[PDB]
């Protein structure tokens, strides 16, 4: 309807990821998770919240999300969440006054306290209904950042608050148990929002996940890494640009092979890429029109693990590799002649793109047109990649469509199969070994995924390079050097990662190797620890090993009993020293792995992340034993 | 067809005795041979040396520590012009071992039709018949018949026998072909251009392990370093083979490829490991043929990342006495010299215990390295250990670089003595 | 119209013109339906007294998301020239007293 240039599908410019409303909440949370203030925390929180006990911030954060997901909120649905802030406000206010007195009377900062626990627990589920869950999981993610902060002040500052020792277990009680129950209360409210609309269209839930990926799911690991000091709060999620027509996707076909074909392979970077490309006017009665058959992403070119998403066919002839060579591109011109002359030129060639000199691009300029003739739908489409132009639209100018954010590159490049059934090959797609590819007469679709510029050392220098300077490393656990077979990736945006592996081996045993190196400087007698983050819903005889491995100089860093258990569960590994694992400056060969033995038929164990922390800056200060 | 009938004569005459040579200079190791006799129908293709050892083999073992379990064929039947006799084509023919992995790919094509549907709608295309009728004032039904012929394997895992047959016929300067397929019991196909006396593929001893094929009229020049033993497709595109391979593997290797581990007996003295029968293998590794090893080939590690690593799966029989004393011998070819050198360890339930480490020289030829005793105990294995493993592993290497590792030993400390000393030249 | 009944230019080679081309497609699934596809020419001659006099022809619809298909029945005096494989179609006598049928 308009010629208007677009950005991200959007008719405006989109807000920079860095910029947004609730950007400061998320940057002093790792600030705290990193080193917790007491009886200080829930001020500052508050007022990043509520500054001056305004609710104007909730506000723009509400008119941001209604502006990503395309969804508007009734007038009278906010003044009610207007109402429930006021109220959440004025008991805070008194809160936070009746502390910042010095000598204040602790048995009234005790009721007070409890007065405003109970009131946010009350006003909780009135941001839980699901007909508008879409925008309030949001507004939602906030509330209990703010109560689950308290709490933990709370169990920090005891006597000082005229709390007694059964107050501070039983706030520990109600601090395990309401980290859970919202974390699986979001989660509900994701996955029925997500699965909503992606029966719709992959586009829309696509929107909808990269809304969650800022405003959500941060925040989240947050509360996760709440109980601990030390740890550092980081998310490698990934930003998902859908560019071509509409497909329904079930969600068991998602986290089934739509995901996995978007990932291809999640540990190497993007090497080439490769597109299906298709022109023909054809009688000129019908206007001209181009199609997408199908998007080959490259990655590891001595591997061949991933392959064509729709088909790379050009002929029928049968003839695509024979002869050494090749076939590129296939023009077939004819002419007419009418006595009372017009060329007619169809065309199937194979675009070829490979990566920059500085292997990533950092936008893209991908566009589609639509054209109604006969309640008949053409298409044309525009593709640049970075610099370099791909594909210039043969039917007519098309507007432009800048795919770009800034602190994020372009990983990954795949499309969606469309016209074709996605309930198969389900148990097939593994992560290895196994021909990661799914037949399609056309996609129609292109989809570009942006990974956060904290993890360009990673799939430019193939290993964890660590320094002296910083206290606290993350490791995703599909960041590895190898893993073993029958492994899945499994979709888990809660833990603020683009995913977690899925280890289902019935055989010879199941191992995932991270490939560690040191810079100039480290301090080898600087002691560390190792954190796991593990799910294990079926009891593991043998349990979950963690060892050192540097050159044959192996040595056992952990051994832990895998008892059911359908949550995540974090184990700890004892105190060590890079002396002892035998690893300098020069060694190459340095290897985390993480181990267990053959599963059963129907059984598998998931493994999130990794946390390394020295001894010094990490102390468990809220214990998760004590339910 | 020669080569191979070369190659299948001196599996017999010559391979063994030379593994007997090499193995004299001790006194307790077990003589031992592996190899497969391999039996080709069809016509002649010329293959050049370097195109075995980088293709053709590759092609012909596929998974090496794998049974097959699954055989499809491409067969094609015409009669058009009734003045030209009928014929048929083996157009391609696809082995399938592990269901679960897909390395294993198209040798020759699958394609039917040119319609580009032979997956979609959820079920995959089987047979298609075009029957053409003529009319003459002055009738003779056309039938043209292009269709995927599967062979599961039997109840007991294995083929025995086989009778795979062709038929030649010459037409104006023009060969036209007939074949004939039967697998065990199974008829897989009967000729339509009429009947072909048969060809009994049998050996007492041997049971029929790969079958497989040789893509004709197309380079061989192609994919060799990409062919590697896992993760990479091992397939290669051929309009047709118009041939058929068949390998018998000796009966002392029909437990592995059964219970895809190695079983230990309290009776035996000495045990042989090829290489080729592991339980995972890394990357960037290649098969090279060492007939002169006694066993269907050795492995090349090439990994220019992580580390190059073997891992073998042991099992103990009800009646081992874990108290007894053993040692390993591991038989390697190091052409560059490696640093960090070879390391054999042994893997039990995270009970990872160091066996040996081997300084790594540069030798043009095989050399043997022998660890210290060990009891099993050490080791904590027992008749009930399921996920026991030998490992034999090495760091990355440079680029160019390879090391090669032919197979193992495990004999009794009593019943090992070495007799000739290998180190005075 | 046109009498093609395949793409590959035989229609009249070898001495002989082409009559009937049928192709049948066989699927797999794991979780069996032969699949005919025909073209064919029809042959009617005039009758042992030179003309006919009545026929039988009909055709029946179907709709099939806003798509249309057709079947078809034809029938020249007493000879069943084409019975319809997609279901039974109801006659449709066309015939006159006092005519008889000079062209189709």
Redesign the interface.
């Given at each position: 309807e308009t010629d208007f240039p677009l950005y991200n599908n959007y008719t405006e410019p989109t807000i920079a990821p860095a910029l947004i409303a609730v950007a400061p909440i998320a940057q002093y949370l790792a600030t705290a998770i990193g080193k917790w203030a007491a009886k200080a925390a829930f001020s500052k929180v508050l007022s990043l919240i509520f500054p001056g006990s305004q609710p104007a911030t909730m506000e723009k954060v509400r008119t941001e999300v209604e502006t990503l997901i395309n969804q508007k909120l009734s007038q009278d649905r906010v003044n009610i969440l207007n109402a429930e802030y006021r109220g959440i406000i004025e008991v805070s206010d008194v809160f936070d006054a009746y502390i910042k007195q010095p000598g204040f009377t602790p048995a009234t900062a005790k009721g007070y306290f409890l007065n405003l626990s109970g009131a946010i627990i009350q006003r909780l589920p009135q941001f839980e209904v699901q007909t508008y869950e879409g925008v309030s999981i949001a507004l939602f993610t906030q509330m209990c950042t703010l109560h689950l902060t308290l709490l933990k002040d709370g169990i920090l500052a005891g006597s000082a608050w005229g709390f007694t020792q059964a107050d501070v277990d039983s706030f520990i009680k109600l601090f395990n148990q309401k980290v859970l129950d919202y974390r699986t209360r979001l989660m509900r409210m994701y996955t029925e929002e997500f699965g909503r609309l992606c029966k719709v269209s992959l586009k829309d839930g696509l929107t909808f996940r990269n809304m969650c990926n800022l405003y959500v799911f941060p925040f989240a690991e947050a509360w996760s890494l709440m109980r601990y000091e030390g740890l550092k709060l980081q998310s490698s999620l990934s930003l998902w640009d859908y560019v071509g027509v509409s497909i329904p996707v079930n969600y068991n076909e998602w986290g089934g092979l739509v995901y996995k074909l978007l990932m291809g392979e999640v540990n190497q970077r993007l090497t080439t890429v490769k597109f299906n490309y298709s022109f023909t006017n054809e009688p000129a009665d019908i206007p001209a029109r181009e199609n997408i058959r199908g998007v080959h992403p490259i990655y590891d070119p001595?591997?061949?693990?991933t392959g064509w998403i729709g088909?790379g066919?050009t002929n029928?002839?049968?003839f695509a590799?024979?002869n050494?060579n090749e076939i590129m591109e296939v023009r077939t011109q004819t002419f007419y002649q009418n006595p009372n002359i017009a060329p007619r030129d169809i065309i199937n060639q194979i675009l070829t793109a490979p990566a920059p000199a500085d292997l990533f691009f950092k936008n893209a300029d991908i566009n589609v047109k639509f054209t109604q003739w006969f309640q008949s739908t053409l298409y044309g489409w525009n593709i640049k990649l970075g610099t370099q132009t791909v594909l210039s639209s043969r039917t007519g100018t098309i507007p432009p469509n800048y795919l770009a954010y800034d602190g994020y590159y372009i990983r990954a490049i795949s499309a969606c199969p469309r016209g074709?059934?996605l309930a198969?090959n389900h148990?097939?797609t593994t992560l290895?070994?196994?021909?990661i590819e799914y037949?399609?007469?056309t996609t129609e679709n292109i989809i570009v995924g942006f990974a956060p510029d904290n993890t360009k050392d990673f799939y430019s220098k193939?290993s964890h390079y660590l320094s002296e300077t910083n206290d606290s490393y993350v490791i995703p656990a599909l960041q590895f050097?190898?893993v073993?077979?029958?492994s899945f990736l499994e979709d888990t945006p809660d833990q603020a990662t683009d995913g977690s592996i899925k280890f289902a081996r019935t055989?010879?045993?199941n191992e995932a190797?991270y490939?560690i190196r040191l810079n100039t400087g480290f301090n080898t007698a600087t002691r560390y620890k190792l954190i796991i983050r593990v799910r294990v819903p079926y009891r593991l005889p043998?349990?979950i090993?963690v060892?050192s491995q540097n050159?044959?100089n192996?040595r056992?860093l952990g051994?832990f009993t895998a008892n059911a258990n359908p949550q995540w569960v974090d184990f700890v590994t004892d105190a060590f020293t890079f002396n002892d694992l035998g690893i300098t400056t020069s060694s190459?060969?340095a290897?985390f792995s993480i181990?267990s033995?053959?599963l059963n038929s129907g059984e598998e164990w998931y493994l999130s992340q990794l946390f390394l922390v020295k001894e010094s800056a990490f102390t468990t200060q809220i214990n998760p034993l004590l339910k």
């Amino acid at each position: 309807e308009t010629d208007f240039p677009l950005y991200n599908n959007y008719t405006e410019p989109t807000i920079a990821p860095a910029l947004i409303a609730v950007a400061p909440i998320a940057q002093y949370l790792a600030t705290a998770i990193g080193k917790w203030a007491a009886k200080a925390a829930f001020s500052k929180v508050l007022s990043l919240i509520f500054p001056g006990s305004q609710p104007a911030t909730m506000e723009k954060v509400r008119t941001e999300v209604e502006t990503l997901i395309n969804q508007k909120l009734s007038q009278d649905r906010v003044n009610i969440l207007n109402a429930e802030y006021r109220g959440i406000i004025e008991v805070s206010d008194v809160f936070d006054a009746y502390i910042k007195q010095p000598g204040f009377t602790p048995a009234t900062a005790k009721g007070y306290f409890l007065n405003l626990s109970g009131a946010i627990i009350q006003r909780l589920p009135q941001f839980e209904v699901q007909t508008y869950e879409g925008v309030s999981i949001a507004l939602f993610t906030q509330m209990c950042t703010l109560h689950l902060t308290l709490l933990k002040d709370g169990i920090l500052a005891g006597s000082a608050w005229g709390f007694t020792q059964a107050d501070v277990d039983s706030f520990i009680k109600l601090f395990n148990q309401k980290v859970l129950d919202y974390r699986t209360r979001l989660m509900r409210m994701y996955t029925e929002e997500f699965g909503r609309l992606c029966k719709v269209s992959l586009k829309d839930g696509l929107t909808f996940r990269n809304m969650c990926n800022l405003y959500v799911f941060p925040f989240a690991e947050a509360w996760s890494l709440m109980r601990y000091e030390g740890l550092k709060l980081q998310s490698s999620l990934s930003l998902w640009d859908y560019v071509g027509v509409s497909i329904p996707v079930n969600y068991n076909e998602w986290g089934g092979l739509v995901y996995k074909l978007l990932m291809g392979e999640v540990n190497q970077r993007l090497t080439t890429v490769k597109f299906n490309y298709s022109f023909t006017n054809e009688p000129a009665d019908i206007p001209a029109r181009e199609n997408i058959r199908g998007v080959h992403p490259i990655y590891d070119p001595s591997s061949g693990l991933t392959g064509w998403i729709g088909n790379g066919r050009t002929n029928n002839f049968n003839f695509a590799d024979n002869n050494g060579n090749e076939i590129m591109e296939v023009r077939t011109q004819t002419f007419y002649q009418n006595p009372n002359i017009a060329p007619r030129d169809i065309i199937n060639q194979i675009l070829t793109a490979p990566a920059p000199a500085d292997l990533f691009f950092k936008n893209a300029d991908i566009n589609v047109k639509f054209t109604q003739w006969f309640q008949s739908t053409l298409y044309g489409w525009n593709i640049k990649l970075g610099t370099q132009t791909v594909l210039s639209s043969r039917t007519g100018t098309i507007p432009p469509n800048y795919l770009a954010y800034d602190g994020y590159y372009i990983r990954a490049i795949s499309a969606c199969p469309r016209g074709v059934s996605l309930a198969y090959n389900h148990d097939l797609t593994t992560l290895t070994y196994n021909r990661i590819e799914y037949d399609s007469p056309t996609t129609e679709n292109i989809i570009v995924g942006f990974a956060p510029d904290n993890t360009k050392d990673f799939y430019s220098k193939k290993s964890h390079y660590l320094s002296e300077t910083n206290d606290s490393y993350v490791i995703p656990a599909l960041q590895f050097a190898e893993v073993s077979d029958r492994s899945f990736l499994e979709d888990t945006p809660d833990q603020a990662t683009d995913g977690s592996i899925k280890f289902a081996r019935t055989f010879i045993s199941n191992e995932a190797k991270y490939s560690i190196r040191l810079n100039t400087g480290f301090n080898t007698a600087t002691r560390y620890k190792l954190i796991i983050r593990v799910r294990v819903p079926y009891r593991l005889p043998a349990g979950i090993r963690v060892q050192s491995q540097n050159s044959g100089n192996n040595r056992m860093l952990g051994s832990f009993t895998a008892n059911a258990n359908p949550q995540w569960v974090d184990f700890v590994t004892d105190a060590f020293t890079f002396n002892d694992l035998g690893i300098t400056t020069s060694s190459t060969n340095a290897l985390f792995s993480i181990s267990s033995d053959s599963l059963n038929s129907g059984e598998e164990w998931y493994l999130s992340q990794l946390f390394l922390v020295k001894e010094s800056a990490f102390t468990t200060q809220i214990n998760p034993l004590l339910k």
